[PDB]
Amino acid sequence: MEAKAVARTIRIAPRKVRLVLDLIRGKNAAEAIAILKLTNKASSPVIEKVLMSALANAEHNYDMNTDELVVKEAYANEGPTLKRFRPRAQGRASAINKRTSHITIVVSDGK
Amino acid sequence: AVPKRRTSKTRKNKRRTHFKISVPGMTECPNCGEYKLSHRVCKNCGSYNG
Amino acid sequence: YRKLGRTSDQRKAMLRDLATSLIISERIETTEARAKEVRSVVEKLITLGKKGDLASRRNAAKTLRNVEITQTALQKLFGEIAERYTERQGGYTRILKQGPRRGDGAESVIIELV
Amino acid sequence: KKAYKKDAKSNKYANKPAEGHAKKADAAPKRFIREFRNVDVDAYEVGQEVSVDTFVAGDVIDVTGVSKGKGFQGAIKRHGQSRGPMSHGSHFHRAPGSVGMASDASRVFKGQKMPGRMGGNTVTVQNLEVVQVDTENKVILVKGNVPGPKKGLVEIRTSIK
Amino acid sequence: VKRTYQPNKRKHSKVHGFRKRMSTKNGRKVLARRRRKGRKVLSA
RNA sequence: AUGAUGAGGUUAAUAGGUUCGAGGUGGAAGCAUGGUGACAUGUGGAGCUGACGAAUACUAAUCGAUCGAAGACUUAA
RNA sequence: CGCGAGCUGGGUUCAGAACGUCGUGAGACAGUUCGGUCCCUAUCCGUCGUGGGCGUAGGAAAUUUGAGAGGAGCUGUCCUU
RNA sequence: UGAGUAGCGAAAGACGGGUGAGAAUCCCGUCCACCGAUUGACUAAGGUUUCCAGAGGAAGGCUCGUCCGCUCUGGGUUAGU
RNA sequence: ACCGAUAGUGAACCAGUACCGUGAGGGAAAGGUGAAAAGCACCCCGGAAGGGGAGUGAAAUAGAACCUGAAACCGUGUGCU
């Protein structure tokens, strides 16, 4: 059927994550983990975690073969941003947005 | 200088047309059984054998 | 040859350090640029060690730190390292790309004596 | 070049179109095919070796080759512009000058000289002479120094003047 | 650069202290006014 | 600048090493001799040599993968 | 009186001080003289280079013609008639 | 939005062995480097627990972190001179 | 025929408090699960956080960042171009 895994308040910017998520969307689940292990980006490990949890939820709660599971969807959504401040010069000060993201992945057999 | 006019959310996405990152250019290891990255040592099990 | 993000004699120092570490350990995991450059430095000392004379020992001594193993590094070279590579005519090393590093993305290789 | 191959992954080997073209002439596949106008066509469609002996010493020549490359070379180096003063409190040293008039042009004109990639052009020199045509070593000695780096292809022909 | 506040316990209490406030009519007006407002910390 | 442009990818001289050169400096260390010593002469145009020229598969360009046609419609000859 | 988000800042009209002159005065020049912080990370058009997508009724490799565009275009002095 | 842009605050690091779910950065070692009328030892003002050990890795640290001047939990200051 | 959380007191919340200042003195933001904690036992991925089931419940997209949950804004998919 379909099995999802969501990771919430992952402390990475969401458009530093959609870079990687634009790769493994539509792919098989084997090459997906291959890519997510081989890539240089810092979003790969957390997305490795999430995609492996998606596959495990499939094979444990829904019992669909972990051989034909294709990543139907994968997307990041914004989250609660931590707003910080940085001392500029001459007494000024500039905001900083330590933003977060919610990483959802949905693997489905396609049947 | 400073921007004279705020950028639409069309021109933005057009400029981010090329903000991709390609895949690494990987292969499968004939020994390890899994995906390695070509011209590199196999992550999983050991050898290179080139 | 290629500047290594370092100043001149700082680069000289780094290369001497890596060649000593190599002939002490026989294999080291370094960055691909550093490995490319040390490949042409650690391999001109094995030549001097395959010569063996006094002048060769001193030309080697001026590019080789002091670390005892007990032996030295120079005794290690003109002693038991130079004898194993007695037949081959150059090409005494190799590089093996491990892959990208975390924190850098630096291309990490494993350099070693053949 | 070599003959056709199946690995053939470096251009050291001809490809099949190139070999059909060169086999039309019963001549081996070749790098640097170039056309010559202005010669009354009196050679053979069958490829016969054009030896350097076509040229005699006391003639005159023009030698076409690509210039030598120099990447992104800025205004002073590329267009022979002067530079600003260096010491009397000046902050203008090697940049271009102004790039137009004020508000009655309101834009930069085409042809404005600006920094960019330099060299690499197909330049031609003219009225060179041939000091010696060394046959049997197959070289020509020209009076001067021609465009291009070492090993740079150069096409020699007779002067248009 | 030398900034305006060079801390000193003795200076701070001898000028802005409690007893220096209570030793005056005006300082007592200040204490009364801060008790009226509800200040957690009356004096310095 | 990056990408691109070129030279190659073992059925291989692309780079590095090794061996010869060129050019550069200018007579290496060791020894012997002559001086009490600083030093001098021979051995010996010596020795060292980044980029330049050749040659040699000794190391590395492995094994792999991705993309990419089978050719629309009228009239005229 | 092209060009200071390309440069300078000498004069010009900032705060100091002084000369001649005028003003009872505070102070003003017809003046004159010495000293005196020149900010910016380029969004759009524009220009200079350099790539990718699709197109050009099959997929390519190579060689090209050239509509059009740009460059160059200066001059002296000696000898001979 | 500007934009994945400017910045990431003066300075030499290298390799090995670990610990680890994860190491350019944390620990140990060797080499190297820098100060040395001082980047060293001690004290007044000031701060007021930042001191130590065991545990941690949400937030802070201009990156990372298995670490810390951060968090949790227990401790630490002894005068007739 | 007064307000209903930007209102009403500066303060519906441990508020003259965080914080700011040498000082006199200035000064905020902060409400709502459910009828009842019945506040998620157990299993799986994970180092944890966080999830997916399984249960409580009338409802869990009421899971303590908890009544509804608008818009700016950020995305994924797709019909016409």
Q: Which residues contact A34 (CB under 8 A, 6 or more apart)?
A: B26, B34, B35
Elucidation method: cryo-EM
Chains within contact range of chain E (3+ C-beta pairs < 8 Å): none
If we measure between CA atoms, which residue out of D120, D136, D119, D141 comes closest to residue D61? D141
D141: β partners: D132
Which helix (H) or strand (E) segment holds residue C54: the answer is helix C54-61
- D143 φ, ψ to 5°? -80, 95
Query: According to DSSP H, which parts of chain B are helical?
Result: 11-15
- Residue with structure tokens 């000392």? C45
Q: Encode burial over D51-60: b for 16+ CB neighbours within 10 A, e otherwise.
A: ebeebeeeee
Domain total of chain A: 1
What letter represents residue D87's amino acid? S
Task: Report DSSP state, residue A82.
Answer: E
In whole angstroms, give the CA distance from residue C24 to residue C30.
15
In whole angstroms, give the CA distance from residue A101 to residue D23.
64
Task: Report DSSP state, residue B24.
Answer: -
The burial class, CB within 10 Å (0-12 / 13-18 / 19+), for C37 is: buried
In whole angstroms, give the CA distance from residue D61 to residue D159.
5
In whole angstroms, give the CA distance from residue E32 to residue E38.
10
Residue C30: CATH number of its domain: 3.90.1030.10
In whole angstroms, give the CA distance from residue D147 to residue D153.
9
CA D32, distance to chain mean position in Å, is 12
In Å, what is the separation between the CA of A88 and the C1' of H7? Answer: 11
Q: Which residues contact A72 (CB under 8 A, 6 or more apart)?
A: A2, A106, A107, A108, A110
The burial class, CB within 10 Å (0-12 / 13-18 / 19+), for D66 is: middle
CA distances from D18 to C43, D7, D12, D36, D137 (A): 43, 16, 12, 19, 28
In whole angstroms, give the CA distance from residue C105 to residue C31.
10
The answer to whether D67 is annotated as binding is no
Determine what percent of chain E falls in helix, strand and coil, rounding each to the nearest 5: 60, 0, 40
Segments making up each domain of chain B, as ranges: 2-50
In whole angstroms, give the CA distance from residue C81 to residue C85.
7
Domain total of chain E: 1
Positions 71-90 of C with beta carbon below 7 A from strand H are: none
Residue A97: CATH number of its domain: 3.90.470.10
Does C96 reach chain B within 8 Å, measured CB to CB? yes
In whole angstroms, give the CA distance from residue E43 to residue D96.
66
The burial class, CB within 10 Å (0-12 / 13-18 / 19+), for A51 is: buried
Which helix (H) or strand (E) segment holds residue E21: the answer is helix E18-22
In whole angstroms, give the CA distance from residue D125 to residue C51.
54
- Residue with structure tokens 């669909």? A64
In whole angstroms, give the CA distance from residue D68 to residue D123.
10
Q: Name all contacts of B44-50 with Cβ < 8 Å and 24+ positions apart.
A: B48/C96
Domain total of chain C: 1
Q: Encode burial over B18-47: b for 16+ CB neighbours within 10 A, e otherwise.
A: eeeeeebebeebeeeebbbbeebbbbeeee
Cβ neighbours of B43 in C, within 8 Å: 99
* 3-class secondary-structure state, position C108: strand
Give the residue from chain B lying closest to C107, CA to CA.
B40
Please give the biggest Cα pair distance in chain C. Answer: 46
C-beta atoms surrounding D112 within 10 Å:
11
In whole angstroms, give the CA distance from residue C43 to residue C89.
11
Which helix (H) or strand (E) segment holds residue C22: the answer is helix C8-25
In whole angstroms, give the CA distance from residue C45 to residue C63.
8
Resolution in A: 3.1
Angle at C32 between CA C30 and CA C35, to 5 degrees: 65
CA D29, distance to chain mean position in Å, is 22
In whole angstroms, give the CA distance from residue A110 to residue B8.
38
Q: HSE-up of D3 (CA within 13 Å, CB side)?
A: 2
In whole angstroms, give the CA distance from residue A9 to residue A97.
14
In whole angstroms, give the CA distance from residue C44 to residue D87.
48
| CB of A54 closer than 8 Å to CB of A98 | no
Token digits of residue C107? 């291309």
Token digits of residue D70? 């120099």
Does C27 reach chain B within 8 Å, measured CB to CB? no
* 3-class secondary-structure state, position A21: helix
In whole angstroms, give the CA distance from residue E24 to residue E13.
15
In whole angstroms, give the CA distance from residue D109 to residue E36.
76
Which helix (H) or strand (E) segment holds residue C27: the answer is strand C27-31
- DSSP per position, D20-65: HHHHHTT----S------SS-S-S-SS-----GGGS-TT-EEEEEE
| CB of C81 closer than 8 Å to CB of C49 | yes
Look at C98 and B37 and tell me if their CB atoms are within 8 Å: no
Domain encompassing residue C93? 1-114
What letter represents residue D34's amino acid? R
What angle in degrees, to the nearest 10, is found between the helix axes of A29-38 and A44-57? 160
Token digits of residue D147? 């465009």
Listed as ranges, the nucleotides of chain G within 7 A of a protein C-beta are: 2-9, 40-51, 60-65, 70-71
Look at C98 and B39 and tell me if their CB atoms are within 8 Å: no
In whole angstroms, give the CA distance from residue A82 to residue A99.
6
Length in residues, chain C: 114
The burial class, CB within 10 Å (0-12 / 13-18 / 19+), for C44 is: middle
Token digits of residue C78? 């003109």
How many helices (H) and strands (E) chain C has is answered by 6, 3
Strands C93-100 and C107-113: antiparallel
In whole angstroms, give the CA distance from residue E30 to residue E28.
5
C-beta atoms surrounding A15 within 10 Å:
13
| CB of A68 closer than 8 Å to CB of A3 | no
Query: According to DSSP H, which parts of chain A are helical?
Result: 18-21, 29-38, 44-57
CA Rg, chain B, in Å? 21
In whole angstroms, give the CA distance from residue C52 to residue C75.
11
